[PDB]
Write a structure and sequence with these properties.
Elements: E1 5-8, E2 12-17, E3 22-33, E4 46-58, E5 68-71, E6 77-79, E7 100-109, E8 116-120, E9 125-130
Parallel strand pairs: 1-9
Antiparallel strand pairs: 2-3, 3-4, 4-7, 5-6, 5-8, 8-9
Length: 131
């Protein structure tokens, strides 16, 4: 597979999905230890956050926020705390072509600190943002 598409934190990466007839852009930036208290969530480690923006380039897009993950370089993975409580969380609402949607996503970091964000759809890694 030609996936994943890799680039830098702070950059917007484009993915074309012709099965869904959509094109979207995702920006991920500002991955960092958070002071957010999520919850009613059972946090085991330290809450981390990133700021994510989805861009509906072609078609209406419903962002697949549950696909996000924070990772270390060797590959330890922390699932997004999709959606749920979390302050100023990105909306999961569908956005029409030409609009964008932004907000925070959170992670429960229980090991080494992450430096990477990756979107994975259960089948493979699609988009990766690294230093």
């Amino acid at each position: 597979s030609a996936y994943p598409i890799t680039g830098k934190l702070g950059s917007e990466l484009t993915m074309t999905d012709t099965v869904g007839q959509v094109v979207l852009g995702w920006k991920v930036s500002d991955l960092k230890s958070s002071t957010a208290v999520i919850p009613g969530y059972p946090v085991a480690g330290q809450v981390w956050e990133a700021t994510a923006t989805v861009n509906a380039i072609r078609g209406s897009v419903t962002p697949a926020v549950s696909q996000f993950n924070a990772r270390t370089a060797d590959g330890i993975n922390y699932r997004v705390l999709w959606q749920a409580a979390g302050p100023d969380t990105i909306s999961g609402a569908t956005i029409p072509q030409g609009e964008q949607s932004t907000g925070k996503i959170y992670f429960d970091v229980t090991g080494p600190s992450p430096t990477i964000v990756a979107m994975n759809n259960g089948m493979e890694d699609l988009l990766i943002w690294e230093p």
